[model samples]
Target: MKTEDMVMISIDDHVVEPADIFEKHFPKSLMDQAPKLTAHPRNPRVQAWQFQGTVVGSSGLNAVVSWPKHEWGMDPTGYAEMRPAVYDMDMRVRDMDANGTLAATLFATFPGFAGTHLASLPDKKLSLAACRAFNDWVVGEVPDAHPGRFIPIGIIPFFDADESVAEVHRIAAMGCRSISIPETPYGVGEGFPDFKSGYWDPIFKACVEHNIVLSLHIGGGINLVKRPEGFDIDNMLMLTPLISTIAATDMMLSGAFKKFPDLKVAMSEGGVGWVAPWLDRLDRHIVNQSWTGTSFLPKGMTPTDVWRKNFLACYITEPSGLNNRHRLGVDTIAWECDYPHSDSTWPRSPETLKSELDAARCTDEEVDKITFANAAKFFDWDPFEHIPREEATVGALRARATDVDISETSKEEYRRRYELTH
Candidate 1:
């Protein structure tokens, strides 16, 4: 591919499929009463947690789940054709191409990362089974449908690291280069380990052994700080990142990087504007707080050393981050257009990206890195081998034209016509 004509790899994008994927595959006995589309006649992707019984009131630590309803409300399938709106592989590929994206990393929205609606142990297993079925279908169906264009990242039942590791190995052997871990572990601090303790050795080892990229995205089963006494759902939702940030920083401070230099950790949908400041603060803490226990760090290395070596940070086209690309490390920054979701750029991604890059004053070389090279390095992708340059350029232009129509469409008209349908 002409370096200029190279296709951008969006490290994050979501595919919210029918929630009962596993139930459809497994015996009906396992899926009985699994959240169904009743009067709504919705798509099969409606995921609901059927708790065997209540456990939220049991302990203070489990207080985050006191509410009776699922975190995301149920949806109306609208029309049968609308079902494809949720996970239509064709629409996704078209949108990706239109948006100047050569490929995307698709993630599961409900039980996989958004752990808000999980039921108790027995029912939770149903969710896990559903996740397995989803991954199987994605590997067998979705990726196969798209060939070299669509890549699906496997979703693991993160509640059990042992099971999670086995699944990672299985997916890796099947030629998957990435796996998604919720920003916070499901039951335990988002399935890896808390920020302070170092319980993620085995999990880290599994990633290194398989050469898989460990991706942490927002909204999972972990809680970092308490929701205030009078907080509303919106406020609580906004607080989700507090936990994720603490977890990301924890991985750095706890020497997770020092222990596993070869491991590549990428934070998806987590913006990069704050990383430079965070690195500065961490470096200062290691020096000023050494008396308070910084001595535990490996001999003479600073906190910044480990961060640069083992971590990859992503930022949308933001002025602060774009201006400081050298400090942030061009090799570490990955750009994204959060497609399909309400907040994503989607059809307007290419134009919006062009504007953002212009605003950021990024050089062509830096643009190349953020758009393609960085992802290639972290995912260990060889452009020449994976997809030829000629094909890549044709794919990009084909995709860009689609977005042109989307970009030209008025926002209100776009929303009225295609936002829900596309």
Candidate 2:
């Protein structure tokens, strides 16, 4: 299939918090307590956020656009070194156009993926206010500013379940399509209940009632879990996606789906490759242990049944995942760009995706479903109505490449690389 014919919609992507995000949204009286971007005292080249007197350093992995491969570690970098699209919506769309992405759904950054940072505040009133400020900024400035180009996923104060439910309804009513949540409520600590404790039922019910997709991003619950001995940064990074697997399995067996059948979940940045085999192992466990009265299976439904009915797994660059779509459920898979992140395939996504689809032997129809159709259906977006016609043209593509403030040498390098691949 031709690149122009592919309608790409990224279900997973991250947005770098703008310098004035909190200052612009927070009330004047509370402005002093609002999150502020300040130079990391230890490393001037690195930037960190100061909120409620707590310092949250930026992750180099989160914004690695022009950095070398070896430098893509945990060493923090300032917003000055990041891509313009990381904060600017117009630049983001241009980047999307260059990458052949019709639309994208963005996740939060400094808010700890699930707003855990803000929710961790000792003062509940201030924490709730901060969460609402962030949501208002994201919903109003990003997606609402450029409809059809980006999908808004709001953050909630996860510490309070009732507050979370109210915020979910508030965002949904304001046209925010989804909410970023910790894969498990237990990960947020501070007396948060375990996944099976039914503590999150009210929030889950609110999500279903509002038709908002519950987006669970890996590392969102980083503070909730303890690391094993000898687990270095690399090991912890490698285990991030694995945590999503455990969370997903927990959700399937937790009976949350049984109670709220309409609840929908999208595991962000977690590739779909592990899902097929995981479900197989789960079903086997269910079958082998059931006769002995040791089974905790949800009455008549199998793990696969529950997953197929309620979950959507996102992938960025997993060819094996695309190949095994039959076992994973075609409709359950969604593509992502992860733009500006170290794992991103931006500038080369179109060519790289083409190669992967060809290698996977996916039919044009299958490619369409995985790339865009499924995301559109899941996010309740209309690609035909939202995608611009000019995006398919070569002129528009080159124009998008020029929108970024890169050297002419870098621009030509990108153009040449893309042309050679095509």
Candidate 3:
């Protein structure tokens, strides 16, 4: 099947907040102190955000689609160095169209994947206000403006569970279908509860009540395990996908699913391939260790059963994961593009998707389920009706044909890396 013929709904893309997000949503009196870009104190060459005296720098890897290969390093500033699609809604849709992506679910980048940065503010009132402002901007300007093309997911103030629950219900009522939360609250300093402590019950119950999916993106404040001294950033990048495994296992063993049966959780940007084996290990431990008479396991339920019922896994470039879909459960898996990121498959996603799906030996029905149907069901989205083919296909060919010039050094470096990987 042709790649363009497939309906792709990406579930793990990211959003680099624009400078105007806080300026437009924050109250006028707080505008001076609201999260905004400022010159990096020590380095005059880059930019950073000053929020209540805490400086947050932009991630270079977060917006590398337009950068030359050799220049790919941590972007210490703001949107001044990123592509237009990184902030502009219209440009994002065009990029999605060029990539043959019908819809993309965006995760937060600057406010700390789970809005941990805002939660870290010194003032509680200010923290909650910042979180509300970001949510208002995202829900109102991004998805609501262009209904089916972008899936709206907001972040809650992680410091206060009650505030988090309120924001969840508030955004859900406003048509935002998902909320990004830390996979684990380990390194978030003080006042945060461990995932195993039942500290998140209120928020989890509220999500279930509002029919909102809980999204746990990797590196979204789950940094308990430190990288070894000899390990480089490359090694950490390779290990990022597996970080969510610990969170999923913890949540299942903690019996959060048992308490809230209707609650749904998505492990975003974490490939589905590891889940089958992880579930097997979980069940094995439950059976073997339960004989020693531990009551940690959920009553009358195995870890695999709970995971199958309440958890969803997302993948971007793993064909083997799709091939093992039967073991993972077809309904529990979804696909993502990771658009505008270094690992993204944009401008060639349709071709890459078709190649991967064909290599996985997936049937037409399986392809449809993984590509679009399952996501629509999971997020309660109607892609066909909202993002009509005729509208989405406009200018696709021209956008795909567009090219950016690169230095000879970068071209050689990019070619060498491409050869090594391909």
Q: Find the candidate with the highest lDDT and give its number.
A: 2
Q: Candidate 1: lDDT over CA atoms? A: 0.59
Candidate 1 C-alpha lDDT tens digits along 207-323: 898788887775552354556689575665445433446557756666666577677778877777667778788788888987765443566777666656666776544556676
| Regions more than 4 Å wrong, model 3 | 75-77, 220-222, 289-301, 389-422
For residues 160-243, could you state the per-residue lDDT of candidate 3 as single tens digits?
A: 888888888889888888898878776676647877788899999888887788888887433677666795778777777766
- C-alpha lDDT of residue 286 in model 2: 84
Q: What lDDT is reached at residue 371 by model 1?
A: 80
lDDT of each: 0.59, 0.76, 0.75
Can you give the TM-score per candidate against the true fold?
0.76, 0.89, 0.89
Give the alpha carbon lDDT tens digit for every residue of 252-273 in model 2.
7787777887788888888887
Lowest lDDT 10-mer window, candidate 1? 57-66
Clashes of 3: 1
Model 1 — TM-score against the truth?
0.76
- 1 or 2, greater by TM-score: 2
